[PDB]
Amino acid sequence: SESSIENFLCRSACVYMGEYHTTNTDTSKLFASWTINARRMVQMRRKLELFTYVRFDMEVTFVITSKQDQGTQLGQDMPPLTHQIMYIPPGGPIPKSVTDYTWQTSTNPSIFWTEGNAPPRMSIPFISIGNAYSNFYDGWSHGVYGYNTLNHMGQIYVRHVNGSSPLPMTSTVRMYFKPKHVKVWVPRPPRLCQYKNASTVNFTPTNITEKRQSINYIPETV
Amino acid sequence: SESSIENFLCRSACVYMGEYHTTNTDTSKLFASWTINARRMVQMRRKLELFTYVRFDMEVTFVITSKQDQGTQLGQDMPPLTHQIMYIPPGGPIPKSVTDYTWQTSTNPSIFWTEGNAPPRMSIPFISIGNAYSNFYDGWSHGVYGYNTLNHMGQIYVRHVNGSSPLPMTSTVRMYFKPKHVKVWVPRPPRLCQYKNASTVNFTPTNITEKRQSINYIPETV
Amino acid sequence: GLPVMNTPGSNQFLTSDDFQSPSAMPQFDVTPELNIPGEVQNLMEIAEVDSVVPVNNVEGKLDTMEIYRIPVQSGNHQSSQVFGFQVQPGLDNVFKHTLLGEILNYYAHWSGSIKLTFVFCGSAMATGKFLLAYAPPGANAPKSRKDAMLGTHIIWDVGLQSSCVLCIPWISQTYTSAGNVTCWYQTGIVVPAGTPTSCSIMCFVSACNDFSVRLLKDTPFI
Amino acid sequence: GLPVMNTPGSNQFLTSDDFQSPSAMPQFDVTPELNIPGEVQNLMEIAEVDSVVPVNNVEGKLDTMEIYRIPVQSGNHQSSQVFGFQVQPGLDNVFKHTLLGEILNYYAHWSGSIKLTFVFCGSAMATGKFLLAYAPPGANAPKSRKDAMLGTHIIWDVGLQSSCVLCIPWISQTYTSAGNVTCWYQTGIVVPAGTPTSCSIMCFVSACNDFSVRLLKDTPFI
Amino acid sequence: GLPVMNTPGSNQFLTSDDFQSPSAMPQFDVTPELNIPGEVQNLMEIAEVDSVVPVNNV
Numbered sequence: 001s002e003s004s005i006e007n008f009l010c011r012s013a014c015v016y017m018g019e020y021h022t023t024n025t026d027t028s029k030l031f032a033s034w035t036i037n038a039r040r041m042v043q044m045r046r047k048l049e050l051f052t053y054v055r056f057d058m059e060v061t062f063v064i065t066s067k068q069d070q071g072t073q074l075g076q077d078m079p080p081l082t083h084q085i086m087y088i089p090p091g092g093p094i095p096k097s098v099t100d101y102t103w104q105t106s107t108n109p110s111i112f113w114t115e116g117n118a119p120p121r122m123s124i125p126f127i128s129i130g131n132a133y134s135n136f137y138d139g140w141s142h143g144v145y146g147y148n149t150l151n152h153m154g155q156i157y158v159r160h161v162n163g164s165s166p167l168p169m170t171s172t173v174r175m176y177f178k179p180k181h182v183k184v185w186v187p188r189p190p191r192l193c194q195y196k197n198a199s200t201v202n203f204t205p206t207n208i209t210e211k212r213q214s215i216n217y218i219p220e221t222v
Numbered sequence: 223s224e225s226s227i228e229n230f231l232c233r234s235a236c237v238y239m240g241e242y243h244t245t246n247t248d249t250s251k252l253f254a255s256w257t258i259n260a261r262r263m264v265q266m267r268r269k270l271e272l273f274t275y276v277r278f279d280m281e282v283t284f285v286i287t288s289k290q291d292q293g294t295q296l297g298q299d300m301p302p303l304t305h306q307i308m309y310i311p312p313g314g315p316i317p318k319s320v321t322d323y324t325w326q327t328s329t330n331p332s333i334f335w336t337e338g339n340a341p342p343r344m345s346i347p348f349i350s351i352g353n354a355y356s357n358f359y360d361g362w363s364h365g366v367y368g369y370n371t372l373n374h375m376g377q378i379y380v381r382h383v384n385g386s387s388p389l390p391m392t393s394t395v396r397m398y399f400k401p402k403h404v405k406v407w408v409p410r411p412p413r414l415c416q417y418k419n420a421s422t423v424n425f426t427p428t429n430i431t432e433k434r435q436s437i438n439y440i441p442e443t444v
Numbered sequence: 445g446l447p448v449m450n451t452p453g454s455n456q457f458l459t460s461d462d463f464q465s466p467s468a469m470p471q472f473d474v475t476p477e478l479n480i481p482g483e484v485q486n487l488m489e490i491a492e493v494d495s496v497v498p499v500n501n502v503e504g505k506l507d508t509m510e511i512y513r514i515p516v517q518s519g520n521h522q523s524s525q526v527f528g529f530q531v532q533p534g535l536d537n538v539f540k541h542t543l544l545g546e547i548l549n550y551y552a553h554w555s556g557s558i559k560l561t562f563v564f565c566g567s568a569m570a571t572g573k574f575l576l577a578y579a580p581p582g583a584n585a586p587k588s589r590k591d592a593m594l595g596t597h598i599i600w601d602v603g604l605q606s607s608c609v610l611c612i613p614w615i616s617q618t619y620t621s622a623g624n625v626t627c628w629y630q631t632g633i634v635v636p637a638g639t640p641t642s643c644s645i646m647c648f649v650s651a652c653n654d655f656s657v658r659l660l661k662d663t664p665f666i
Numbered sequence: 667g668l669p670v671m672n673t674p675g676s677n678q679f680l681t682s683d684d685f686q687s688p689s690a691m692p693q694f695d696v697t698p699e700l701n702i703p704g705e706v707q708n709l710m711e712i713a714e715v716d717s718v719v720p721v722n723n724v725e726g727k728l729d730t731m732e733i734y735r736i737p738v739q740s741g742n743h744q745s746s747q748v749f750g751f752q753v754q755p756g757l758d759n760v761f762k763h764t765l766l767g768e769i770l771n772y773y774a775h776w777s778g779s780i781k782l783t784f785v786f787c788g789s790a791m792a793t794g795k796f797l798l799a800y801a802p803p804g805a806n807a808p809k810s811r812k813d814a815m816l817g818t819h820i821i822w823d824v825g826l827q828s829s830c831v832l833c834i835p836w837i838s839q840t841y842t843s844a845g846n847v848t849c850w851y852q853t854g855i856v857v858p859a860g861t862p863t864s865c866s867i868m869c870f871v872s873a874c875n876d877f878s879v880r881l882l883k884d885t886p887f888i
Numbered sequence: 889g890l891p892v893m894n895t896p897g898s899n900q901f902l903t904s905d906d907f908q909s910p911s912a913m914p915q916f917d918v919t920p921e922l923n924i925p926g927e928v929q930n931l932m933e934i935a936e937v938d939s940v941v942p943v944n945n946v
Contacts, residue, residue: 002773003709003879007471011328012681019385042888043328050712053702059687061679061896063334067389068299076299087690109690110903115301116338117899118677123687131700171301172385176334176681186704187712190768194888207728209720210759215736216750216848218807219841222364224551225487225657234459264666272490275480281465283457283674309468313774314883327884329772331468332681339677340455340894345465349881351775351838353478364843371840398459408482409490412546416666429506431498432537437514438528438626440585441619445907447667454672455894463673463893466683472880669889676894685895688905 005182008047012061012178015041021069022160022169030098030160032173036153039198052186053132056179058124060156063174066115071168081169082161085111085120090127090152098159112161127153132185136201146200227404230269234283234400237263243291244382244391252320252382254395258375261420274408275354278401280346282378285396288337293390303391304383307333307342312349312374320381334383349375354407358423368422487547488655494561495543497647499527516566518641520632523589526574526645528626531558531612533649544651549663554617556655560610560625564602566633566643571603573630581614581623589628599630611652709769710877716783717765719869721749738788740863742854745811748796748867750848753780753834755871766873771885776839778877782832782847786824788855788865793825795852803836803845811850821852833874 001007018032036058038044048054066081087109088094093102102108113120130150137148158173160166193203223229240254258280260266270276288303309331310316315324324330335342352372359370380395382388415425484490498511505511514527533539534548548554562576576599577592579585586592600608612623633643706712720733727733736749755761756770770776784798798821799814801807808814822830834845855865928934 001473002471002882003769004471005707005709008709008772008882012332013326013328014334014383017385041326042323043326043884046885046888047328051706052704055699061334063304063336063383063679064301065304065336065384066299066301068297070295070298070389072297074297076297078299081301089691112901112903114901117901118339118894118897119334119336119679120900120902121687121897122690122902122904124690125694126696127691127694128697131697132702167299169299174304174334174383183699184706185702187706189765191888192763205729208733209723209728209763211723211725211728212759213724215722215724216747218750218752218846218848221804221806222841222843224660225547227485227487230487230550230660265662268663268666273484274482277477285457311469311774311881311883313881315886323888324884329882329884334679334681336679339679340672340675341457342678342680343465343675344468344680344682346468347472348474349469349472350475351777351880353475354480405477406484407480409484411543413666414541427507430511431501431506431541433501433503433506434537435502437500437502438525440528440530440624440626443582443584444619444621447908447910449668449670450894451669451671451889451892454892455674455676457674461674463675463891465675466680468682469881470682470684471882473878671890671892673891673893677896677898679896683896685897687897688902690904692904 005184009056009182009184010178010180012059012176013041013044014174015044015177016175017172018158019170019172020158020160021171022162022166027097031095032158034156034175036155037151042195045195046191049135049191050188051184052136052188053134054182054184055126055132056182057126058153059121059178059180060124061119061121061176061178062113062158063119063176064113064115064158064171066169066171069168069170076167078167080115081171082112082114083171084159084161085113085122086157087122087124088155088157090154092154094155095157103159124154132183136188227406231278231404231406232400232402234281234398235263235266236396237266237399238397239394240380241392241394242380242382243393244384244388249319253317254380256378256397258377259373264417267417268413271357271413272410273406274358274410275356276404276406277348277354278404279348280375281343281400281402282346283341283343283398283400284335284380285341285398286335286337286380286393288391288393291390291392298389300389302337303393304334304336305393306381306383307335307344308379309344309346310377310379312376314376316377317379325381346376354405358410488651488657491544491547491651491655492653493543494648494650497538497542497649499529499538499647501538512646514645514647516633516643516645518633518635522629522632524629526627526629528585528624530620530622530624531615532617532620532622533558533615534617539649542649544649546663546665548617548657549665550660551657552659552661554655554657556615557652558612558615559650559652560612561607561648561650562600562610563607563646563648564643565646566602567635567639569639570633570635570643571601572633574600574602575628575630576600576608576610577626577628578610578612579624579626581621583623585624586626589630592626592628710873710879713766713769713873713877714875715765716870716872719760719764719871721751721760721869723760734868736867736869738855738865738867740855740857744851744854746851748849748851750807750846752842752844752846753837754839754842754844755780755837756839761871764871766871768885768887770839770879771887772882773879774881774883776877776879778837779874780834780837781872781874782834783829783870783872784822784832785829785868785870786865787868788824789857789861791861792855792857792865793823794855796822796824797850797852798822798830798832799848799850800832800834801846801848803843805845807846808848811852814848814850 016034020032021029024030038048064083092108093105095102111120128150133151137146141147193206196202238256242254243251246252260270314330315327317324333342350372355373359368363369415428418424496512499514500511529538530536533545539545575592575597577595577597718734721736722733751760752758755767761767797814797819799817799819
């Protein structure tokens with residue numbers, strides 16, 4: 001009952017933590033971004049690799065905390081801060097500044113949230129023109145080995161929702177991810193070697209198991 | 223009706239209070255931990271010792287309060303803080319730093335919470351490969367007298383959920399514990415001596431009761 | 445959707461609330477229960493059991509088995525007192541640490557009837573008579589054998605019966621305002637040649653079925 | 667309208683909660699499912715599959731195919747041991763990385779029965795006898811061929827059968843307190859002229875249908 | 889009265905939520921609809937119409 005597929009896979013986890021400012025002199029530090037896949041979380045990756053094909057919905061919750069920068073200026077009286085969390089489907093426009101037009105496109109779903117309230121949450125369906133996702137692909141992208149374009153799942157972007165000339169602030173977002181209504185096909189053996197990077201199956205050769213003293217050795221009984 | 227087993231045992235109590243920081247130079251002060259048993263709360267211990275075998279579910283609520291350290295730096299503007307509360311079942315990985323991999327294992331249930339909201343709460347079932355817990359064990363662990371491994375109930379760990387290079391803060395957690403759906407077997411006499419430590423039944427010999435003047439003495443009637 | 449309105453009391457933690465809670469281990473089937481002998485539904489099953497009273501709680505013997513033995517002396521003393529006490533379970537030192545006393549000290553109000561048993565532990569050759577007398581609450585303890593005979597009493601011949609039983613009907617709690625019990629030598633003990641001279645009596649206390657308790661509180665012993 | 671009252675636990679984020687969530691892409695009809703061969707409902711379908719045991723896990727050959735081969739030597743050694751091990755899946759090095767071992771290491775409590783198969787990989791001209799012996803948990807491993815005969819054993823003639831099967835009934839987890847298995851030369855191997863002299867045995871392990879697991883946790887291998 | 893318990897997600901603004909809202913002009917009867925020719929239920933009615941291709945885009 002605890003070994004069913006749902007109870008084994010449907011569990012929440014922190015998969016990305018990022019920081020972003022209201023004012024800066026880099027302009028890439030003004031927003032945070034994440035590409036959705038399940039290959040940079042080493043514990044979820046291994047449980048997912050026991051199968052060849054998967055199908056699930058996604059649920060994402062966001063925990064967001066702010067701070068005034070230790071730069072100099074005190075005595076402030078500020079209202080609570082507002083944030084915008086945008087999801088981009090596969091085949092959507094990507095922003096490059098925080099002032100871009102794509103933060104207003106009608107087909108990118110978006111959430112507006114102010115601090116002090118309950119943590120925000122959105123639910124994404126199975127988004128693929130194929131019939132399942134694949135954890136393993138023995139092919140070419142059209143050319144990269146092992147990468148097929150049916151596994152695109154979208155992106156998430158987060159910014160502040162101030163007006164003009166805002167006050168300096170630093171925020172941190174943590175994303176909690178959970179698959180739901182899961183189905184799996186074609187079981188596989190468990191990964192025996194350590195993972196080396198996030199896109200390949202590359203590995204250094206590993207021992208089959210650890211040694212004992214002799215082929216007869218059994219430890220003394222208590 | 224007030225002497226039923228449920229009304230006598232099913233009551234909430236503070237069993238652990240701990241402190242933890244966001245930055246420190248000890249690295250064990252960065253998280254808080256507690257092992258679940260009912261032997262370091264002297265009032266609950268005594269009521270539980272009236273029986274030899276017990277079976278219950280657990281309910282745990284957490285009250286969490288923070289403070290900026292009196293070190294030096296003022297004028298800050300901070301978002302509300304996020305905390306992670308992890309439960310480890312019996313037979314689970316234990317963290318040793320706050321940056322460890324075990325804070326992300328898919329089989330350790332975890333709660334994410336931000337200040338200002340209602341206090342968080344989780345519910346744990348009866349977790350034992352045996353059929354009941356035991357308050358008394360006249361045996362050996364396999365060797366410690368009086369300790370049997372079927373009484374393992376898990377652990378709780380609490381940390382902050384910031385990003386990189388956080389600001390200094392100190393938090394305190396209080397854990398409130400409550401058993402539910404309780405059943406007891408084999409009543410015992412009440413503890414007459416004071417408790418000496420948390421793992422044994424050791425004691426110094428005690429008087430049976432206090433004295434009076436003579437075996438005939440009855441006090442004058444009003 | 446569904447217009448809704450928050451009432452006072454929202455988002456508070458009440459230590460005695462009763463709400464459904466989310467399980468942290470939903471995919472875990474618990475060990476089924478075993479039919480262990482000796483199950484308890486109510487604490488009044490512990491108080492209805494007899495336990496030995498330390499009636500001899502005088503100086504010099506609070507740490508010996510002698511505290512439990514009422515001395516019967518040899519020779520002719522056929523109007524002297526043997527023992528006497530007030531019937532005050534919960535408060536009085538002689539009843540305070542019994543099985544009935546230890547329960548009653550968890551509650552702030554209680555009431556019922558009480559059962560006292562007396563047993564003669566002498567040789568099978570000894571004969572004699574005792575007078576057992578009961579005074580109600582608000583009455584003074586008798587000063588002689590004759591005025592104890594003029595109240596409620598039983599005459600107990602130990603050559604015929606080895607044990608006597610008493611049931612006391614009006615027990616409550618708060619220079620006492622409680623009833624009392626006393627014992628007198630009616631005749632003196634008579635033996636043949638070659639038997640021990642002195643002997644002992646023992647008291648057992650218990651509760652009768654109509655016992656009730658209210659307002660669970662904390663006990664004053666640990 | 668509709669008077670309403672907020673309870674404790676409001677506006678918290680519990681990592682294992684189960685609530686309905688708003689969809690971010692409501693106007694999107696999903697690809698219908700395909701009937702892919704090889705669907706899985708439960709992890710116990712992976713553990714019921716045989717896998718090869720690395721019984722020869724001694725020094726110098728932990729990275730070769732030789733780790734899987736039990737050596738049968740030539741000549742007359744008709745009372746010597748061939749191999750022996752304790753039956754401890756999950757903990758012991760020889761069973762730890764199999765398909766059954768890898769599953770069991772996701773759970774903190776498990777129990778069931780186990781199936782071991784032995785296969786003789788020699789030429790079709792070779793004949794001889796082996797003695798396969800089982801000692802229960804709490805018993806010492808036999809030291810000779812005769813006391814292994816005095817317990818539970820099977821005599822396996824490889825000129826008649828190429829494979830033998832064993833089913834072990836009382837398996838649980840935590841100088842082991844586990845059962846063991848040993849193999850002895852009853853006769854020695856006999857060949858005609860022109861056949862290879864040495865040969866090999868292979869072991870396969872699997873789980874039987876009554877296997878259960880509890881308390882999902884994190885695995886100690888990545 | 890009516891014991892009640894707030895869940896996570898309370899008091900958040902989700903940009904794609906779907907809730908009943910209070911009207912700011914309740915005492916206002918709206919103009920009834922007219923039967924205008926040329927109503928559309930679906931964008932695929934626009935794509936099923938022919939249009940001229942600029943094949944000579946040199």
